[PDB]
């Protein structure tokens, strides 16, 4: 099972 | 099972 | 099962 | 099982 | 089982 | 489940 | 589960 | 589970 | 579980 | 479990 989770945040 | 989750946020 | 979820937000 | 989790945040 | 977790934060 | 919440306020 | 919450305030 | 919370405030 | 919390405040 | 908490304050 491939599970990927990615996030990028600029303030 | 492929599960991908991705998010990009600029403020 | 392929499950993809993607979001991009600019404010 | 591949599980990846990645995050990048700039303030 | 591959489990990766990575984070980068700049303030 | 992707849940995003973002707000920007200038006074 | 991805949960993101972000806020920017200028007075 | 990815949970991110970020805030920037200028007065 | 990735949990990130970040804050920047200028007065 | 990755838990990060960061804060920067200028007065």
Curated annotation (Swiss-Prot), chains A, B, C, D, E, F, G, H, I, J:
Intracellular or extracellular location(s): Nucleus; Cytoplasm; Cytoplasm, Stress granule; Mitochondrion
Tissue: Ubiquitously expressed. In particular, expression is high in pancreas, placenta, lung, genital tract and spleen.
Post-translational modification: Hyperphosphorylated in hippocampus, neocortex, and spinal cord from individuals affected with ALS and FTLDU. Phosphorylated upon cellular stress. Ubiquitinated in hippocampus, neocortex, and spinal cord from individuals affected with ALS and FTLDU.
Disulfide links within the chain: none
Top-level taxon: Eukaryota
Comment, domains: Consists of an N-terminal domain (NTD) and two tandem RNA recognition motifs, RRM1 and RRM2, followed by a C-terminal glycine-rich region. Contains a nuclear localization sequence and is mostly nuclear; however, its nuclear export sequence permits it to transport mRNAs to the cytoplasm and even to synapses as part of neuronal granules.
Subunit structure: Homodimer. Homooligomer (via its N-terminal domain). Interacts with BRDT. Binds specifically to pyrimidine-rich motifs of TAR DNA and to single stranded TG repeated sequences. Binds to RNA, specifically to UG repeated sequences with a minimum of six contiguous repeats. Interacts with ATXN2; the interaction is RNA-dependent. Interacts with MATR3. Interacts with UBQLN2. Interacts with HNRNPA2B1. Interacts with ZNF106. Interacts with CNOT7/CAF1. Interacts with CRY2.
Function noted in UniProt: RNA-binding protein that is involved in various steps of RNA biogenesis and processing. Preferentially binds, via its two RNA recognition motifs RRM1 and RRM2, to GU-repeats on RNA molecules predominantly localized within long introns and in the 3'UTR of mRNAs. In turn, regulates the splicing of many non-coding and protein-coding RNAs including proteins involved in neuronal survival, as well as mRNAs that encode proteins relevant for neurodegenerative diseases. Plays a role in maintaining mitochondrial homeostasis by regulating the processing of mitochondrial transcripts.
Disorder noted: Amyotrophic lateral sclerosis 10: A neurodegenerative disorder affecting upper motor neurons in the brain and lower motor neurons in the brain stem and spinal cord, resulting in fatal paralysis. Sensory abnormalities are absent. The pathologic hallmarks of the disease include pallor of the corticospinal tract due to loss of motor neurons, presence of ubiquitin-positive inclusions within surviving motor neurons, and deposition of pathologic aggregates. The etiology of amyotrophic lateral sclerosis is likely to be multifactorial, involving both genetic and environmental factors.
Protein name: TAR DNA-binding protein 43
Organism: Homo sapiens
């Amino acid at each position: 099972d491939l599970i990927i989770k990615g996030i990028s945040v600029h303030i």
